[PDB]
Amino acid sequence: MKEFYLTVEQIGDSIFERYIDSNGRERTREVEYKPSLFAHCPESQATKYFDIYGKPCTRKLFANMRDASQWIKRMEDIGLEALGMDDFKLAYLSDTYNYEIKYDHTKIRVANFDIEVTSPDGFPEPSQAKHPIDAITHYDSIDDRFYVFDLLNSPYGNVEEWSIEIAAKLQEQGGDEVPSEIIDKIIYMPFDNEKELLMEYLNFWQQKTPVILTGWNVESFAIPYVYNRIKNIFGESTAKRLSPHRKTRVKVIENMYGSREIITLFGISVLDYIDLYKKFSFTNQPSYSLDYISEFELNVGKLKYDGPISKLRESNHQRYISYNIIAVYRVLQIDAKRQFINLSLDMGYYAKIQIQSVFSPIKTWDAIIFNSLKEQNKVIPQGRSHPVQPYPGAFVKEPIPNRYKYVMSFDLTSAYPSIIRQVNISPETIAGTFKVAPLHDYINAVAERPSDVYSCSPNGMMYYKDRDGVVPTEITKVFNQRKEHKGYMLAAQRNGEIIKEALHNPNLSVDEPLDVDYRFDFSDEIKEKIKKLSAKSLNEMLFRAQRTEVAGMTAQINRKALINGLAGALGNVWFRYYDLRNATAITTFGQMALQWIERKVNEYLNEVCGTEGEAFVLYGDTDSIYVSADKIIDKVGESKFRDTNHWVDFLDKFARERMEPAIDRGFREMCEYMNNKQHLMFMDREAIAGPPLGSKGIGGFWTGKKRYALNVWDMEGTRYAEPKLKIMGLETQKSSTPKAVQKALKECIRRMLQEGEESLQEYFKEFEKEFRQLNYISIASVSSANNIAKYDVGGFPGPKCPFHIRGILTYNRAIKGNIDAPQVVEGEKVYVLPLREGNPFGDKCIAWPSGTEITDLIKDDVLHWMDYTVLLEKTFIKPLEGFTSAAKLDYEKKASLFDMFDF
DNA sequence: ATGTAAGTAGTCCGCG
DNA sequence: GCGGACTACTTAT
Ligand SMILES: [Ca+2]
Ligand SMILES: [Ca+2]
Ligand SMILES: [Ca+2]
Ligand SMILES: [Ca+2]
Ligand SMILES: [Ca+2]
Ligand SMILES: [Ca+2]
Ligand SMILES: [Ca+2]
Residue whose C-alpha is closest to residue A370's, from A362, A378, A358: A378
Beta bridge partners of A61: A36
Nucleotide nearest to A727 (CA to C1'): C12
Pairing label, strands A700-704, A402-403: antiparallel
Q: Do residues A236 and A249 lie in contact, with contact meaning Cβ atoms separated by under 8 Å?
A: no
φ, ψ at A404 (rounded to 5°): -140, 110
Which residues neighbour strand C (beta carbon < 7 Å)? Answer: A 284, 394, 621-624, 706, 727-729, 733-736, 782-787, 790, 800, 802, 804-805, 829
Burial class of residue A695 in the structure, from the number of CB atoms within 10 Å of its CB (0-12 exposed, 13-18 middle, 19+ buried): middle
Cβ-in-10-Å burial (0-12, 13-18, 19+) of A677 comes to buried
Element (H, E) at A833: strand A829-834
Rounded CA–C1' distance between A736 and B5, in angstroms: 20
Cβ atoms of residues A56 and A45 within 8 Å: yes
Q: Which nucleotide is nearest to A362 (CA to C1')?
A: B2
Which of the 8 DSSP states describes residue A572? -
Contacts of A303 (CB under 8 A, 6+ apart): A291, A323, A326, A327
CA A735 / C1′ C11 distance in Å: 10
| A113 in Cβ contact with A206 (< 8 Å) | no
Query: What's the resolution in A?
Result: 2.1
Distance CA A72, CA A354 (A): 23
Give the number of whichever ligand sits closest to the CA of residue A135. Answer: 1
Pairing relationship of beta strands A407-412 and A683-689 according to DSSP bridges = antiparallel
Over its C-alpha atoms, chain A yields an Rg (Å, rounded) of 31
- A732/C13 CA-to-C1' distance in Å: 18
Ligand 7 centroid–CA A815 distance in Å is 10
The Cα–Cα gap between A481 and A365 comes to: 16
What is the Cα–Cα distance from A298 to A893, expressed in whole angstroms? Answer: 42
Tell me, letter by letter, the H, E, C secondary structure of A395-462: CECCCCCEECCCEEEEEECCHHHHHHHHHCCCCCCEEEECCCCCHHHHHCCCCCCCCCCCEECCCCEE
Distance, in Å, from the CA atom of A329 to the CA atom of A335, rounded to the nearest integer, reads 10
Closest-approaching ligand to the CA atom of A655: 6
How many other CB atoms sit within 10 Å of the CB of residue A524?
Answer: 7
Q: Are residues A504 and A477 in contact, defined by beta-carbon separation less than 8 angstroms?
A: no
Question: What does each C-alpha distance from A607 to A614, A626, A655, A667, A685 come to in angstroms?
Answer: 10, 18, 15, 18, 20
Give the count of beta carbons closer than 10 Å to the beta carbon of residue A598.
21
Which domains are assigned to chain A? 1-108+340-382 (3.30.342.10), 109-339 (3.30.420.10), 383-468+573-729 (3.90.1600.10), 469-572 (1.10.287.690), 730-774+867-889 (1.20.1280.300), 775-866 (3.40.1820.10)
Which protein residues have a C-beta closer than 7 A to any atom of strand B? A 357, 359-363, 390-396, 398, 561, 564-565, 567-569, 571-572, 574, 587, 622, 703-707, 729, 731, 799-803, 806, 874, 878-879, 882
3-state secondary structure A632-656: HHHHHCHHHCCCHHHHHHHHHHHHH
User: Is residue A831 within 8 Å of residue A287, measured between CB atoms?
Assistant: no
Q: Let me know the angle formed at the C-alpha of A369 by A13 and A70, rounded to the nearest 5 degrees.
A: 30
A20 closest CA partner among A33, A2, A37: A2
CA angle A376, A378, A384 (to 5 degrees): 145
- Long-range contacts at A123-127 (CB < 8 A, ≥ 24 apart): A123/A822, A123/A823, A124/A225, A125/A258, A125/A259, A125/A260, A126/A220, A126/A221, A126/A224, A126/A225, A126/A227, A126/A228, A126/A260, A126/A261, A127/A224, A127/A228, A127/A252, A127/A259, A127/A260, A127/A261
Q: A37, A44 in Cβ contact below 8 A? A: no
How far is ligand 7, taken at its centre, from the CA of residue A838, in Å?
15
**SS3 (DSSP) at A868:** helix
Report the C-alpha gap between A317 and A162 in whole angstroms: 7
Nucleotide nearest to A564 (CA to C1'): B2
Which residue from A452, A418, A465 is spatially nearest to A679, judged by alpha carbons? A418
Angle, CA A7 vertex, CA A342 and CA A212 arms, to 5°: 40
Tell me the CA distances in angstroms from A216 to A180, A293, A500, A849, one per residue in order: 22, 10, 35, 17
Instruction: Give the separation between CA A423 and CA A456, rounded to whole angstroms.
Output: 6
Distance from the CA of A805 to the center of ligand 7, in angstroms?
A: 21
Phi-psi region of A414 (alpha: psi -120 to 50; beta: other; left: phi over 0): left
- Sheet with A110-116: strands ordered across: A186-191, A145-151, A135-140, A110-116, A212-214, A269-270
Amino acid identity, residue A656? R
Of A194, A257, A261, the residue nearest A229 (C-alpha): A194
Q: Are A124 and A103 in contact (CB under 8 A)?
A: no
What DSSP line would sit under A278-335, residue for residue? HHHS----S---HHHHHHHHH-PPP---SS-GGGHHHHHHHHHHHHHHHHHHHHHHHH
Which residue, counting CA atoms, is nearest to the C1' of nucleotide C10? A734
Considering only CA atoms, which of A299, A297, A239 is closest in space to residue A273?
A297
Given the DSSP bridges, would you call strands A212-214 and A110-116 parallel, antiparallel or unpaired? parallel
Nearest-angstrom CA–CA distance, A651 and A654: 5
Which residue type occupies A282?
A: F
CA A855 vs. chain centroid, Å, equals 31
SS (H, E, C) A199-259: HHHHHHHHHCCCCEEECCCHHHHHHHHHHHHHHHHHCHHHHHHHCCCCCEEEEEEECCCCE
**Among the listed residues A699, A713, A803, the one whose alpha carbon sits nearest the alpha carbon of residue A753:** A699
Pairing of strands A430-433, A461-463: antiparallel
Please tell me the distance from the alpha carbon of residue A277 to that of residue A649, in angstroms, as a whole number. 38
Note the maximum CA span of chain A: 102
A878-887 helix and A739-754 helix, angle to the nearest 10 degrees:
20
> What's the CA gap between A787 and A200, in Å, rounded?
42
- What method was applied to determine this entry? X-ray
Residue pair A411/A405 in contact (Cβ under 8 Å)? The answer is: no
Backbone angles phi, psi at A145, to 5 degrees: -135, 145
Measured between alpha carbons, how far is A644 from A693 in angstroms, rounded to an integer? 5
DSSP-derived 3-state class of residue A479: helix
What is the Cα–Cα distance from A647 to A406, expressed in whole angstroms? 10
Residue in A486, A452, A463 with CA at minimum distance from that of residue A586: A463
Nucleotide with smallest C1' distance to residue A569 CA: B2
Eight-state DSSP code of residue A855: P
Q: How far apart are CA A483 and CA A652, in angstroms?
A: 22
Nearest protein residue by Cα to C1' of nucleotide B12: A800
Q: A128: which residues sit within 8 A by CB, 6+ positions away?
A: A228
Cα torsion angle, A241, A242, A248, A252, sign: negative
- How close is the Cα of A736 to the center of ligand 1, in Å? 26
Which of the nucleotides in strand C have any atom less than 7 Å away from a protein CB atom?
7-13
Ligand lying nearest the CA atom of residue A170? 2
Smallest CA–C1' separation from A834, nucleotide? B10
Task: Count how many residues are written for chain A.
Answer: 903
Distance CA A134, CA A229 (A): 12
CA distance A673 to A678: 12
Examine residue A807 and say whether the peptide bond preceding it is cis (omega within 30 degrees of 0): no
Q: Are A406 and A651 in contact (CB under 8 A)?
A: yes
Phi, psi of A810 (to 5 degrees): -60, -45
Rounded CA separation A156/A293 (Å): 31
What values do phi and psi take at A723, rounded to 5?
A: -55, 145
C-alpha span between A822 and A824 (Å, rounded): 7
User: A746 CA to middle of ligand 5, Å?
Assistant: 22
3-class SS of residue A463: strand
Cα angle value A622/A436/A453 (rounded, 5°): 95
Q: Distance, angstroms, CA A663 to C1' B5?
A: 25
CB A98 within 8 A of CB A3: no
* Dihedral angle sign, alpha carbons of residues A188, A235, A273, A93: negative
Residue A515 CA, ligand 4 centroid: distance in Å: 18
What residues contact A57, with CB distance under 8 A and at least 6 apart?
A38, A39, A40, A41, A47, A49, A50, A51, A83, A379
Least distant ligand from the CA of A501: 4
Smallest CA–C1' distance to B3, residue: A568
- In order, the DSSP letters of A877-889 are IHHHHHHHHHHT-
Please report, rounded to whole angstroms, the spatial distance between the CA atom of protein residue A212 and the C1' atom of nucleotide B7. 40
- A203's CB contacts (< 8 A; 6+ apart) are none
Asked whether A625 and A691 are in contact (CB, 8 A), the reply is: no
For ligand 4, the distance from its centroid to the CA atom of residue A495, given in whole angstroms, is 16
Nucleic acid strand B: bases within 7 A of protein CB: 1-12
In one-letter notation, the amino acid at residue A452 is D
DSSP percent split of chain A into helix, strand, coil, nearest 5? 45, 20, 35
Å between CA of A800 and C1' of C6:
10
For residue A78, give every residue at least 6 positions away whose Cβ sits within 8 Å of its Cβ, in sequence order, or none: none
Round to a whole number and report the distance in Å from the CA of A885 to the C1' of C8: 27
Cβ count within 10 A of residue A784: 14
